[PDB]
């Protein structure tokens, strides 16, 4: 349901709504660590 290859055509959208977090670890920001990488590929982790 969520395809980032097509959502890239929308200049305004982002892979992660939560600001500060990395686009790969777009989950709850208990510590909000910019140096933590949850997922490996940017298709299984879209938000």
């Amino acid at each position: 349901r969520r395809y980032i290859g097509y959502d890239a055509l929308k200049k305004n959208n982002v892979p992660c709504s939560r600001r500060g977090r990395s686009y790969y670890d777009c989950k709850k920001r208990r510590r909000n660590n910019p140096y933590r990488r949850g997922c490996s590929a940017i298709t299984h982790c879209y938000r």
């Binding site: 395809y3 980032i4 290859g5 097509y6 890239a8 055509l9 200049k11 305004n12 982002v14 600001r19 500060g20 990395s22 686009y23 790969y24 909000n32 660590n33 910019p34 140096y35 990488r37 590929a41 940017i42 298709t43």
Partner: protein, 335 residues
Amino acid sequence: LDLKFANNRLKRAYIALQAWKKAFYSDPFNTAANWVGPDVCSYKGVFCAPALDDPSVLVVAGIDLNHADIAGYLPPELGLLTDVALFHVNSNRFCGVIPKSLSKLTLMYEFDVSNNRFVGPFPTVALSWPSLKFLDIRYNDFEGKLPPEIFDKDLDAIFLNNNRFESTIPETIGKSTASVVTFAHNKFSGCIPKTIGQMKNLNEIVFIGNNLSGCLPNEIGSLNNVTVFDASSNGFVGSLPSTLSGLANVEQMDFSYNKFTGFVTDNICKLPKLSNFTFSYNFFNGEAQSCSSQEKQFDDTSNCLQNRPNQKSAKECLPVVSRPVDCSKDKCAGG
């Protein structure tokens, strides 16, 4: 100067941010009014974390400036802004070419200058970043050739939409690990190289709105685990290859607004995962017997199917040589 910082490494970040604050020509959200004082970790947009070098010391680890319309240019004083890995500067009115001094950001992991007014050639400084895995320069005015050195690096995502590239797709495309790549709304000339199937990991891919030509390189069938394949609004000519039946994991495909000829195969078009298979606004003498029943989504408009409605005037459907290109002797499809 009468300020002391927690460490020496955040001192350089203060120098970069204040100089980069002086490069802010506009900020309607007043998100930069907080950028005063030595307590950099409380600035809006920057974020701190214990340094991977030593957990005793904390450093500016990332900068996040999502939409927040911000205007200006990136000054070369950002080279002091070391250890940052995420640089989300999207949807803000920044200008000027990416500074060469950003090559000092050896820890750059994801770089997000999407939806900006950056006008340059391609950023040959964005190639010195070894840890870079996410790169998007979409909705920018970049010009010229796309360097083949980009795909040789272990990248995970490459976004190039809505730019002004004018070269051809490099033959090095096969060497890329890049899960997702986007060439949409660009002026890519030439043919698709026959080195795709050397991917083995490509998930999504798009080619919407390009001035690309040539018969389809049949080696695309080797993409066993691929999800999105799109070639809309292109000038592709020829028939659909039969070897594309290897795309077992494909979920959506689009081939509209092209000048394809030939036959539609019924073999792969019945895939349990394939959805919204659009081939409208094309030429197809073949039939879609199993390829408009409503368990999935198919589009057959302006396709010249006599049995199907919404076709094109027989005077517009093949009033020229009804022979497709042979897809043989063609430099883009074989010998």
